[model samples]
Target: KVFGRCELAAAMKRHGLDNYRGYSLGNWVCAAKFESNFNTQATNRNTDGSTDYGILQINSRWWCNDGRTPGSRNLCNIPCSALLSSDITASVNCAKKIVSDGNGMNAWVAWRNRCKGTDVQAWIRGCRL
Candidate 1:
């Protein structure tokens, strides 16, 4: 789904992602904006033949797998297609794990480059959530 800024904030907060691992809700929303523009269907095909999926663009190379490829590591243990669902439950959970570490937000350069090192308050302005 193509979510408005506030909508994504509400979603993230509802899933207990607000301040998960020290990042604020604003950071999550801003990262989603730059990563997939809040669209769960977004994907990025890497040169290594792996693709990124979902709002946070979880990398298929390591985090998630299509389930057809053997010898791959699916840390999330979820189907890559699950990451593409607008429901976002699986997507959010997977992202939580990805960002569980202290600097885990750096797992996605989109967050590091776009949300971090910036004033992201504007990203969730008036979200009222």
Candidate 2:
């Protein structure tokens, strides 16, 4: 799921996860930071326009687990891709079905626990929730 940066940021803001700002910014920065070092302009040969688009780095083309094009794509619907699309809230809600899953905070927690250096928590002190 490659919705790219702008769209991804918007989605994350909408869902509530821009740098752990309370809700979850949907781990937008966490995911994008991991996916492309927070580089909105970054592009991968694996994805391109017409199929995957924007910062979420989502492959919207496979909206229904089919090679078919995306139509009414969103987090609620099932996409052909293995991991759910970047709509973090929706994806986490979906993950609720799986007991062992850590909702969508897995990336954020992972970062907080590992990738984020020791002073990370301090850095994120004013970073809301």
Candidate 3:
């Protein structure tokens, strides 16, 4: 499922991305737009053979146990399929784990090139959160 900007913001807020990192809600929202376009059904395969899943495009090799990713660490203790849920709760939670590992939003290359240090106030401009 796809999400509107505010809808994605509210969901991320509920799951603890708003002020959890040094980054704020706007940063997370901005990175998300570039990562997965606010859609929950993404399967981006990397050149290294790992796959990315869901809105965060979480890597199967490091976070989810996709079995196909090879050298799966599965640190989030979840199936890659779980990240595809439209609810987004699990996806956000796992992405939090990614951030907690000190990778910050840099874990997503799209964020590095598109959202990192970029002014994203407009991304969530209409959101009540």
Candidate 4:
């Protein structure tokens, strides 16, 4: 269960700290555990009836790839290597864009700011993440 990859772990660490807002990396990891179980390929069903996919549990298929507009890019489309590529920078960045809309912290910020909290979705609903 200890899927240790220093560079990738470091990437996740640096990226987590770089994005931590109020929550700690431990917290982010906590939410991720609930959301994806540390599986980069994991996806979740949104409360709004949409599907949130990938590391950040992104729902908008359009967020990752334009070609899959209005839908999602099947697991085969995720490019497993990409998960380990760029220290997960690409995946983290993609997550940020989906949440922050290019003007906000994006994924990095969310991971750091809201990852560790009593309620990860609280910020999204009322407070700050």
Model 1 bad stretches (over 4 Å): 68-71
* Tens digits of per-residue lDDT for model 1, 1-129: 898889889989999988888788888999999999999999988777788899989988677888644466898999899999988899889888888745678988988888888998888898989
Q: lDDT values of the candidates? A: 0.87, 0.41, 0.87, 0.45
- lDDT (Cα, tens digit) per residue for candidate 2, span 1-129: 445445555655555344442334434445455645544334333333224322333444332233444353444366534333343554433333321334433433334444443332332333333
Put down candidate 3 lDDT per residue, 5-109, tens digits, no spaces.
Answer: 999999888888887877788888988898999989978988998999999899999899888876789899999999998988898888888988877778889
Worst 10 residues of 4 by lDDT: 120-129
**How far is 65's C-alpha from truth in model 2 (Å)?**
15
Report the lDDT of model 3 for residue 56. 85
The TM-score leader among the candidates is 3
Clashes of 2: 25
Models sorted by TM-score, best on top: 3, 1, 4, 2
Regions of candidate 2 where Cα sits further than 4 Å from its true position: 1-15, 18-23, 47-52, 63-129
Alpha-carbon RMSD of each model: 1.5, 8.4, 1.0, 8.8
The CA root-mean-square deviation of candidate 3, after full C-alpha superposition on the true structure, stands at 1.0
Worst 10 residues of 3 by lDDT: 115-124
Q: TM-score of model 4 relative to the true fold?
A: 0.47
- In order of appearance, the predictions have TM-scores of 0.93, 0.33, 0.95, 0.47
